[PDB]
A paper describes a structure:
VapBC TA systems are the most common Type II TA system in bacteria, and consist of a VapB antitoxin and VapC PIN domain-containing toxin. Like many Type II TA systems, vapBC expression is auto-regulated at the transcriptional level through direct binding of the higher-order TA complex to two operator sites (OS1 and OS2) in its promoter. The related vapBC locus on the chromosomally integrated Escherichia coli F plasmid is mutated in bacteria that are tolerant to beta-lactam antibiotics, before subsequently evolving resistance.
Moreover, the structures of VapBT3NC (2.6 Å), VapBT3N+A13P+L16RC (2.8 Å), and VapBV5EC (3.2 Å) revealed complexes that are virtually identical to the wild-type complex. This demonstrates that the overall architecture and integrity of the VapBC hetero-octamer are unaffected by the tolerance mutations. However, we noticed that the DNA-binding domain of VapB appears to be quite flexible and with low local resolution, which means that side chains are not visible in the regions containing the mutations. Of these, Thr3 is close to DNA backbone and could interact directly by hydrogen bonding; substitution to Asn could therefore potentially affect this interaction due to its longer aliphatic side chain. Interestingly, plasmid loss assays show that all substitutions that cause antibiotic tolerance also reduce plasmid loss compared with VapBQ12C (all P < 0.0001).
Residue numbers in the entry:
A (entry chain A), B (entry chain C), C (entry chain C), D (entry chain A): 1 to 132
E (entry chain B), G (entry chain B): 0, 1G, 2 to 68
F (entry chain D), H (entry chain D): -1 to 68
Amino acid sequence: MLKFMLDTNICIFTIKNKPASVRERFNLNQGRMCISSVTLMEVIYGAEKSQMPERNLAVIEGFVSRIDVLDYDAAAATHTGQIRAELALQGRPVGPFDQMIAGHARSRGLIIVTNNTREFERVGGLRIEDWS
Amino acid sequence: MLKFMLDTNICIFTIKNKPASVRERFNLNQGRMCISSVTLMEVIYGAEKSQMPERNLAVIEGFVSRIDVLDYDAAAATHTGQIRAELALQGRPVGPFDQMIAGHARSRGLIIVTNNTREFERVGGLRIEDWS
Amino acid sequence: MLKFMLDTNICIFTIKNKPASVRERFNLNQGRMCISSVTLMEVIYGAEKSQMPERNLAVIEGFVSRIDVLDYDAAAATHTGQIRAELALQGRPVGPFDQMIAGHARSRGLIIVTNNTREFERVGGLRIEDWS
Amino acid sequence: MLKFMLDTNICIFTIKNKPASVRERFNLNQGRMCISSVTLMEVIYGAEKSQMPERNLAVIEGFVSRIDVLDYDAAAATHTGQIRAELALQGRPVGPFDQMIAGHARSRGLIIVTNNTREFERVGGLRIEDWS
Amino acid sequence: HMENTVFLSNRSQAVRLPKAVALPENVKRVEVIAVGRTRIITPAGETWDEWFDGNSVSADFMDNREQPG
Amino acid sequence: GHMENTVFLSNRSQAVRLPKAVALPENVKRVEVIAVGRTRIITPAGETWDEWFDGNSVSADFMDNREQPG
Amino acid sequence: HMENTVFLSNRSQAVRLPKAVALPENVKRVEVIAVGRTRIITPAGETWDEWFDGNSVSADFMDNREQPG
Amino acid sequence: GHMENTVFLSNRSQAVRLPKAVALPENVKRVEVIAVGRTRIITPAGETWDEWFDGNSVSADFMDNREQPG
């Protein structure tokens, strides 16, 4: 039933700001949404480096409990190894986490849901969507 | 039972140089050894960016199929977040993949095997060994 | 998600003295807290050997039922063995129950909360906190 | 189907010496035998403190893979809390691990299988057997 | 405020829901979410309303993501 | 934590099967229900720390003679 | 020495066992034990013979159990 | 590791279902069988380290420019 993978940027964006236009999108696409463990790593970091971790961790838990968290598996690691080389041929930069998120999506055939498509456009063969 | 998680650094070191001193630790601890899928991503990238990918992929495959490969899951992700913050608040720098490998191992209580002990010694509550 | 494993020492300390400074850490980290079944054994013993066991049992029950109690399983056992040997080969003394609690926590990557930090600081790859 | 719990003493005894009279007993009672996590803690320790750990760990693995390892749960911890007090009333000594092994057996209604009954006789309501 | 009892039903846990805190009749499907020992009972398709309207993160939260690049 | 369901009515009220993926601690037998919007939040009855801290205390002989061998 | 092929049978893994290394006809039930990537195939009731006859621990192993008392 | 079974005969030999509790890595498709007593021991074909160490090597351009950002 799954269809969309929320990258980190949309996750922050939503967690930090809770936009109304995102709430409808989430309410409506409940059950077809997931994140990568890599994105989870980052929001947990934001909570844990913040000045009120136990509060922010609790806000994370409620977000993550509503969606699936997918393990970054050998399939994601393979596709990421290809992508990192694909970018070497194209000569365009991408951040580490983001390329693992991309590989993970391609490995499972999921649509990247983001707010900043400009990074994910450089890598090949992905459906990308902007929910901002 | 698993016991050791091999750093990406030492993996590169052994695939390249195949030193007898690691061969001995490998023969003794066969079956007690694993790598994070993070590391699997890195070597697949080195192979795919080589001139002879199918060759180096095949040597990569030979090494990995004697390994247990662990998926970078939610536990690993969360421990990485705590590590990124534990380090940040102490100003200690450690690379992103290395952070995810440390967290993966700490999340499961594994001993990290690395030759970059100096970086990994900066992480809290993590047992470190150098097999080179 | 769980994060902290409460030492038997601190449990005794709080059940006895109920200090506001621990009450505050308890209120902040509620849901992130557990005890080893090893510790459950110890307090049940203190209650059963008291004059008013059904009373102290009941106060024991009140404290434990706000806790997640973890079973001392094979992972915990194996890490304890490594700890008993890691300590022995360094000549550092730590009590048997404390060793099993340390191993249990290390086996799952939990932070130990204790006021006997000096003993638990002797254990390798284990994060320690004092909430008193 | 389970019926017998091997205490630590019989486990060492068997692992260190491999008596022929024990082999028949084990061969014949295969499927009805188990140990406590507590006993596992101790054999792992013996391997890990020994001068050839990876060898002794492998001998452990083959032993333990043939039997069940039971988690020291809240039920075992309760019964151990009772026993430790029962011994305070009777004024007779018992080692820490051993009283947890006893409580575990009583909690699951299993027969203690040992080579040194003299310790386990002091605690009440247990079927005990000597397989030496 | 309004305490309650836990049922065992359909080999699973269930919950009596007294009249004073009843769901509106507009609802037949429910999404239930687990956080700690608490369970959130939302009308399916209103799954996120409790989280958007509920508590929020401190203002310092993730002012940059600090991905190298 | 995600898991969908259908509300069925009991003899007196509405009820909700908690599928295994979501189920509470079996230790929990009483629950508090809070109404927030069109959403209901259930919590294990009487589990904040302030009740326990301000509540009943142990007898002064439950002591620190911990009797860990040494 | 004698290599082999892995079958998928009864929704499970299975193993062709060539004639040169066949079990005796005395055997119909088998206990199979897992250690690392290796599986031990013993006649039921001869479960422990391979472990008793096989490798052993070094002579220093657990000369005392070091339980306090 | 304990798990009991019954040996069934194939078209050419005896065979053994490996119940899930015991099953090998699905990664393993070839196996070596060793006869020891009335017991058979199966092992994943070609997995000792000495074959790999003495065996094929990577091209000298698979390098230590690890490209971990910093």
